[PDB]
Structure formats: structure tokens, C-alpha cells
């Protein structure tokens, strides 16, 4: 659509102008902070992990002794070297940002300290190449601080740990890095291998309603809750990253799909359900899934699968996945969508039930222009292709009225019910 194509550049220009640091291409502090604030809040995204704070040694000195232009060039030079080291860790993806000239950060949710230690050294070792290069004249180049943050730690709290690490690193004339101070690594292992075998995850449901008619329910997202010794539940956030460090994620989709598939034959409502990259990465349990889908031909209409915008395979494959699905009469959509159209290309070609907007963009839309603006930009470019839009993490009576002003299709979030277990 010659139309779509204009509105999908106009929307991506508007991402970059808003959330992209122009120099390095990395996220701006604004975006970054929106993520931290928005992740801690979210039971399914939080929050064990690590924080990287890097400050470059002697900004001022560098500017005098080398002048602004060759200084700017330098931070480009590190943006890169940061990304390069942070590739190995996917969770970090999209979370590498530059706060202030000379200072950058990476949120690495669900990161092992040992991983952190290794990351710092590799990064530190890699960072020095710049000095030799002639890029900087300070040999130590930059200071590296890694703060470990527990989940349930407020973002402000999380940042504060980071400042200490950087400072700790700074007060060290031997090395340039540091990290503050499992567990337990094997307890999680055993607890999880176990619960999977024993089919011991519960099915939680969150309502998704029409934005126009709040009373009108489009579908219930099925979230996951791990059980523990006392049938207490544990939320996707805490445990998910542990499935990954262990490779058991596909195990879960497979389970959580057998359970949904049965339970749906208890009623007639419409559901929605995650589908990991790790089930798509593997071709063995991936295909399992279609077979499960094939047997239950009947419910394809009532079920809808959901990938994270980050977890996408190649548009080439995606086309394959979206199609092979439609054949089974089942629907597909995207979640944690953040306007990276350039990545999809073939979107209008896919035939998605909808896109669920990462909700990091929703919180305080009424009150925060740049967000409201960026989304208006998006609905417009997905209106054209009659691809419905759903907002996650709507909590406030206000945020809602702004979406009705925006004419999005639908809403999900604390405002319409936390996730619970109704059938």
C-alpha cells in the first residue's frame, strides 16, 4: 500500500526522533527509563537481572585535548563496542542506551552474576582497543560498573545500585570495572524441571475488551503461573528467564498449549497465548505444536498465538508461520510491539489478528505528549491495513480516554482486571 508505506516511515522517523539517541543510535535515557519503570511494574517481565553503567574517563579532558568532533566520534566508537559485547545477551536487546555524553547503560534482566563478571571483563578488554586505535588518549578509557538488582526493586533503587558500582569501579586504580554483592541456581533447576513434569503451572487469564465498549470482551490472554511447595504461584517474570538459562522454554509452550486446548472445551470464550521463540527456534517441538493444533481443528477460531516483537524469526519464516497457521484456521498476532516496522516489511502480507502495543508506551499517555503522539502515528499506519490495535498496561481512567480519542481497537490491563483463574 503506497499509503501504509508513507505512514510507516513517518512513524519510524518519529520513534527515532523520540527514543533514539541521535549520535550513537542507542536508546535515549528517556526511552531507557520508560523501560525500567515499565518492567518492574509488570509481573511477567520482572525482574531479576543486572545493570551496566559505563562512564568514559575524562570527557572534559578529551574535549580539550582532542576537541568536540573527535570526541563525538569516540562515543560512536563505544556505542558500537558496547552493543557488540551485549549481543551475546539477548535480554539486553533494545535495552542498551546512552544516558549522557560519556555515560551509557544496559539493563540485562535475568542475568547471572558470573555472566556479568564475564561481560564486564570482555567489555573492558574490548573497550581498550579504542585507546590503541588512537581514539582516546586515556589508557583506562572508561569505567565499568555492574550492579545486580533483585526483582521488586524499584527502578530508582535499581539505578542507585548502579551508581555505587560505577563509583566502586572508579575508586580503583588497578582495574576499571567492578560489581557489587544462584541463588539458588540448582534449587531453581530442580523446582522447574519438576513442575514441568508434574504439569504444575496454573492457567491465569487477563481480560481484553473493546476500547469503545469496556464491557465487551474480545479475548482473555492466558498468562503463566508457576506453582511452588504450597501451591503458591510465581509469575512469568521471575521464572521465565530461568527456563531459558536451562533450555526448557519449549517444554512450557507445549504444556501450556495442551492445557489451554483442553480447558477451552469447557466454554466458548476466546483465548490468547504466548508462543516462545525457543519453540520456533527448535524445529522438533515447533512441529509438535502444529500437530497439536491439527488435532483440535475446531478451536482455531477461538485461539490466537502471540510472539514478542523481539522474538521474531525472519520475515521469510514468519510468512511461513502465519500462513501454515491460517491453513489450520488458527490466528496469530504480535505483542510487546514498539513500532519497529522496518523489521517486519511483510507485515500487511502476514494477516495478523492484531498487534498488542508494548505497554511501556501506554503508561501516562494522557499526560505525556511524545508517547500519545508516537501511538497516534501507529494506529494511523495500521488502520490503513485494517490491523486492529490493542493496548497493554492500561491502568488509569485517563489513559483510557486518550485511546478512545485515538480510536484504537482494544484494551488490556489493571484497569479491567488483574490476571486470575476464572475458566
Residue numbers in the entry: 219 to 399, 407 to 648
Paper text:
Here, we elucidated the molecular mechanism underlying the function and regulation of P. fluorescens LapD, a transmembrane receptor essential for biofilm formation in this strain. As c-di-GMP levels change LapD switches between two states: the dinucleotide-unbound off state that retards stable biofilm formation by facilitating the secretion of the cell surface adhesin LapA, and the c-di-GMP-bound on state that supports cell adhesion by preventing the release of LapA from the outer membrane. Here, we present three crystal structures of LapD from P. fluorescens that provide models for the c-di-GMP-unbound cytoplasmic domain lacking only the HAMP domain, a c-di-GMP-bound EAL domain dimer, and the periplasmic domain.
In order to elucidate the molecular mechanism that regulates LapD function, we determined the crystal structure of the intracellular module of P. fluorescens LapD, comprising a HAMP–GGDEF domain linker segment and the degenerate GGDEF–EAL domain module (LapDdual; residues 220–648). The structure of LapDdual (space group P32, one molecule in the asymmetric unit) was solved by single-wavelength anomalous dispersion phasing using selenomethione-substituted protein crystals. We also obtained a second crystal form involving different crystal packing contacts (space group I23, one molecule in the asymmetric unit), yet the overall structure of LapDdual in the two crystals is identical (root mean square deviation [rmsd] of 0.9 Å over all atoms; Figure S2A and S2C). In both cases, the biologically significant unit was predicted to be a monomer, based on energetic and geometric estimations. LapDdual adopts a compact, bilobal conformation. The GGDEF domain, comprising the N-terminal lobe, caps the dinucleotide-binding pocket of the EAL domain, which forms the C-terminal lobe of the tandem domain structure. The EAL domain buttresses the N-terminal S helix via predominantly hydrophobic interactions, burying 1,170 Å2. In addition to the S helix–EAL domain interaction, the GGDEF domain contacts the dinucleotide-binding surface of the EAL domain at multiple points, forming a loosely packed interface that buries 1,620 Å2 of surface area. One such contact, the salt bridge between an arginine residue (R450) and a glutamate residue (E262), forms a particularly close interaction. While E262 directly occupies the dinucleotide-binding site, the loop itself is located at its periphery, partially blocking access of c-di-GMP to the EAL domain. In summary, the structural analysis of the cytoplasmic domain of LapD reveals that in the absence of c-di-GMP, the protein resides in a conformation incompatible with dinucleotide binding, with the GGDEF domain restricting access of c-di-GMP to the EAL domain.
